[PDB]
Every structure is written in structure tokens, then in C-alpha cells.
Amino acid sequence: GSSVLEELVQLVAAANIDISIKNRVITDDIELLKKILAYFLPEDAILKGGHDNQLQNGIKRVKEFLESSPNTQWELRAFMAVMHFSLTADRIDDDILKVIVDSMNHHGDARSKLREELAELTAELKIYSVIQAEINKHLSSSGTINIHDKSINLMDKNLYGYTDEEIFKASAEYKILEKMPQTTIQVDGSEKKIVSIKDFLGSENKRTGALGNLKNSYSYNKDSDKSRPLNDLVSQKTTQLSDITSRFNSAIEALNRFIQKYDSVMQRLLDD
Numbered sequence: 001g002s003s004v005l006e007e008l009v010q011l012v013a014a015a016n017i018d019i020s021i022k023n024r025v026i027t028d029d030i031e032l033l034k035k036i037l038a039y040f041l042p043e044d045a046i047l048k049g050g051h052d053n054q055l056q057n058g059i060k061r062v063k064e065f066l067e068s069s070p071n072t073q074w075e076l077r078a079f080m081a082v083m084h085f086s087l088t089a090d091r092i093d094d095d096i097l098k099v100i101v102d103s104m105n106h107h108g109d110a111r112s113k114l115r116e117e118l119a120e121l122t123a124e125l126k127i128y129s130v131i132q133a134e135i136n137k138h139l140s141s142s143g144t145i146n147i148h149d150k151s152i153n154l155m156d157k158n159l160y161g162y163t164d165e166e167i168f169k170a171s172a173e174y175k176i177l178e179k180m181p182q183t184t185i186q187v188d189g190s191e192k193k194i195v196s197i198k199d200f201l202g203s204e205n206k207r208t209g210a211l212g213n214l215k216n217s218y219s220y221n222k223d224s225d226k227s228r229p230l231n232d233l234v235s236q237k238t239t240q241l242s243d244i245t246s247r248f249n250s251a252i253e254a255l256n257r258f259i260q261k262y263d264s265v266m267q268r269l270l271d272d
Contacts, residue, residue, distance in 0.1 A: 001043050002034075007059065008083065011031045015066035021076045021266075022107075025149070035140055036193045039078055040265045046087050049181060058087040077262055078104030084258050095244070096251040114255060123172035124206055125245050128238040131197050135181045135231045145230065146161065147201070148216030149185055153194035179205040201234065207244070208237045 008028055012019060018027040026032055049055040065082045078101050082227075085092050085100070096114070103113040134152050138145035155177050157168035168174050180203050183196045201211045211233055218230040 004046055004055065005034050005037050008037055009064065011062060011066065011226055014084050017066060017072055017074045019074045019076055026076065037083065039269060040261070041083060043085060046091070047089065050201065061086040065101060069101065069105065069112060073105070075107065076129065080262055081258060088252060090257065092251055092254055093247055096248055100255060111255060114248065116249060118163070118245070118252070119172040120208065121241065121248055123176055123244045124208060125238065125241045126160055126173060127154060127176065127200065128234065128241060130154065131234050132238055134197065135234060139231065143220035146217045147214065147230070148183065148196035151194065151196035151198060154197065154200050155195035176206055179203065208241050
């Protein structure tokens with residue numbers, strides 16, 4: 001009981017942080033800190049696992065957060081976000097936590113920073129789903145997909161739900177697309193500039209990793225040890241993006257559960 005809490009509190013001294021509320025500074029008030037923890041993490045809430053092992057796992061992650069962050073100044077709520085989201089049944093992955101934690105420590109808005117990151121990811125994913133459906137179609141109809149000079153233009157607002165060019169430019173989709181290189185083509189009569197499937201996929205300027213040696217056309221077996229087809233390469237990227245996206249999306253209700261829990265532990269401890 002009391003011992004796990006003693007262990008966590010000591011964790012602020014091992015890390016060289018000050019914790020303030022937020023305008024009380026409270027790092028040295030060891031009795032307050034423990035009450036806050038006591039109030040916010042019921043005993044049977046802090047996970048142990050059968051062998052304990054989970055508590056070791058949780059303290060390890062708490063410790064990791066405290067030495068990773070650049071801030072010596074921790075806002076109390078961010079500190080409690082780490083505890084909540086590392087030690088309990090409601091734990092989330094390190095990436096979402098860093099997003100939440102950092103913006104809390106710079107007195108920003110964790111909820112919007114999370115939605116925003118979620119939007120960047122959803123944008124990328126939408127663009128990949130376009131590539132995916134384009135790749136399938138060309139194999140399905142003619143056996144060959146060109147991603148270079150005859151690519152769909154990915155820089156096209158109507159691919160993403162937008163009906164007005166200007167609004168598209170404020171989009172997460174557009175911010176990504178405009179970091180991409182472009183390729184000169186001739187469709188009908190005139191010169192036009194596009195963001196080819198190849199331009200996007202070969203880029204380092206997105207979350208997902210670049211594909212390194214993309215050819216201009218992928219075909220069905222025309223005539224080894226050679227690696228994967230285009231459709232399989234982009235299939236893998238879209239699946240890992242799709243997992244990250246579902247986690248960040250779940251983090252939203254999680255964040256809300258914690259904000260209301262935290263707002264109702266601050267309220268209950270602004271008396272004693």
C-alpha cells in the first residue's frame with residue numbers, strides 16, 4: 001500500500017524535477033504529493049501482474065518519461081498523466097503519452113494537440129488509401145500500374161472530400177502533399193504539374209517511412225530472390241499507419257476520462 005506510493009514520490013527526487021500546480025510549487029511537500037497519488041491511484045488500481053512484474057514495468061516507464069522530457073519544470077497534471085497512463089489499466093503507448101505530457105508541461109492544450117496529431121495521421125492514411133485503391137484497380141483491369149508520368153495526381157482536393165481549393169489548403173492532407181516533390185506531365189494538350197504516387201511514396205517528409213527504389217511502373221509477372229511488389233509494400237505502410245491511427249483515436253476518450261478524473265481530484269483536494 002503506502003510503499004508503492006513512497007516509491008513513486010521518491011521518483012521525483014531521482015529525476016531532478018520540480019512539480020508545481022499552475023500557483024503552488026510542491027516538489028518538496030512529500031506528504032501532499034503522496035496524498036495526491038493516494039487519491040488519484042487507488043491501491044488495487046496500480047497494476048502488479050502475477051509475477052510484481054507489471055509494477056516493475058510501470059515504474060520503468062514512469063522513470064523513462066521523467067528523464068526523456070527536457071523540462072525540469074513539471075506541471076502537476078502532466079505528472080499525474082504519466083502515473084495514470086503508465087501504471088493503471090488505462091495505460092496508452094509512449095507516443096500518445098509524449099504528445100499529452102509535453103503540451104501539458106508547456107501549458108498548452110493536450111486535447112487539441114492530440115486531435116491535431118490524430119488529424120496528421122488520418123490525412124496520411126487517407127492519401128495511402130487513395131494509393132492502395134489506385135494500385136488495385138490497375139492490376140485488376142490491365143495488370144500494370146504506372147506511378148510516375150501516368151500517375152493519378154495526388155494533389156487534388158476532390159480526392160479528400162474538399163469542394164473548394166482554399167479550404168483544401170488549410171487541410172492536414174494538403175500540408176502533407178505540399179512537402180512532396182512534383183512531376184511534370186502532359187495529359188491532354190497542356191503542361192501540368194502533379195504529385196505522383198511515386199513522389200509521395202519516395203518521400204522522407206511524412207510519418208511512414210520512404211520506399212527507396214521505386215520504379216515508374218509495376219506489372220503482373222511479365223516472364224528469384226527479388227523482393228516485394230508495390231501493392232504489398234504500400235499495403236504494409238498503410239497497416240502500420242492504420243494501427244497508430246486507431247490508437248491515437250482511442251486516446252481521445254482516454255484523455256477525457258483523465259481530465260475529468262483529475263479535475264475531480266484537484267477539487268476534492270483544495271480543502272484538505
